[PDB]
Design a protein around this ligand. Structure first.
Ligand code: HEC
Length: 116
């Protein structure tokens, strides 16, 4: 995927999320209603500290799931469906109220990039 493009596309995410490095550096100063995305790639889902996630995503991580660019790219398009399928639960609910139409892989790549 394209990171250069992903950064530009992150415009749909900053409304709720931010990209903040461990020493506090503000890579992307966004909102605090969604968890910090710095390092999400490789991270077990629904585990960022001091963040109150909806249940399903926490269950997904409890099952051993860590995000990849690929899944990130997919989830982003339809979070709730993503979950229902992963969890094999028709009843899986998402706390993320946005579906991105096009851009997943790029945004996915960007996110991977950010920690280099
Ligand atoms: C607010 C209306 C949001 C926008 C815009 C975006 N995201 Fe989001 N995201 C939001 C919430 C409330 C949460 C927590 C989910 C839950 O059910 O509790 C999330 C979560 C994610 C995650 C999962 C993070 C984890 O630690 O597992 C990812 C990977 C994610 N969001 C990506 C993402 C992207 C790429 C966005 C922009 C295109 C984006 N989100 C926007 C809320 C909101």
């Amino acid at each position: 995927g394209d990171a250069a493009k992903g950064e530009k596309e992150f415009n749909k995410c900053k409304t709720c999320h931010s990209i903040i490095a461990p020493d506090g550096t503000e890579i992307v100063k966004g909102a605090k209603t969604g968890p910090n995305l710095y390092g999400v790639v490789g991270r077990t889902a629904g585990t960022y500290p001091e963040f109150k996630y909806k249940d399903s995503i926490v269950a997904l991580g409890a099952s051993g799931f860590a995000w990849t660019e690929e899944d990130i790219a997919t989830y982003v398009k339809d979070p709730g469906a993503f979950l229902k399928e992963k969890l094999d639960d028709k009843k899986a609910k998402t706390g993320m109220a946005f579906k991105l139409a096009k851009g997943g892989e790029d945004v996915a790549a960007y996110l991977a990039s950010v920690v280099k």
